[PDB]
Write a protein that binds this ligand. Structure first.
Ligand SMILES: *[C@H]1O[C@H](CO)[C@H](O)[C@H](O)[C@H]1NC(C)=O
Ligand SMILES: *[C@H]1O[C@H](CO)[C@H](O)[C@H](O)[C@H]1NC(C)=O
Ligand SMILES: *[C@H]1O[C@H](CO)[C@H](O)[C@H](O)[C@H]1NC(C)=O
Ligand SMILES: *[C@H]1O[C@H](CO)[C@H](O)[C@H](O)[C@H]1NC(C)=O
Length: 9
C-alpha cells in the first residue's frame, strides 16, 4: 500500500 518516507533531520 501507499508508503511514506521520512525527511532526514
Ligand atoms: C514508500 O516506501 C516504500 C518502501 O519500499 C517504497 O520505497 C515507496 O516507493 C515509498 N513511497 C514513496 C511515495 O516514497
Ligand atoms: C510516512 O509518513 C506518513 C505520514 O502520515 C506516516 O507518518 C508514516 O508512518 C511515515 N512512514 C515512516 C516509515 O516514517
Ligand atoms: C521521504 O524520502 C523520499 C526519498 O526520495 C522523498 O524525498 C520524500 O519526499 C520524503 N518525504 C518527506 C515527507 O520528506
Ligand atoms: C526519516 O526519519 C525516520 C525516523 O526514524 C528514519 O530515521 C528514516 O531513516 C529517515 N529517512 C531518511 C531518508 O533519513
Amino acid at each position: 500500500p501507499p508508503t511514506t518516507t521520512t525527511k532526514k533531520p
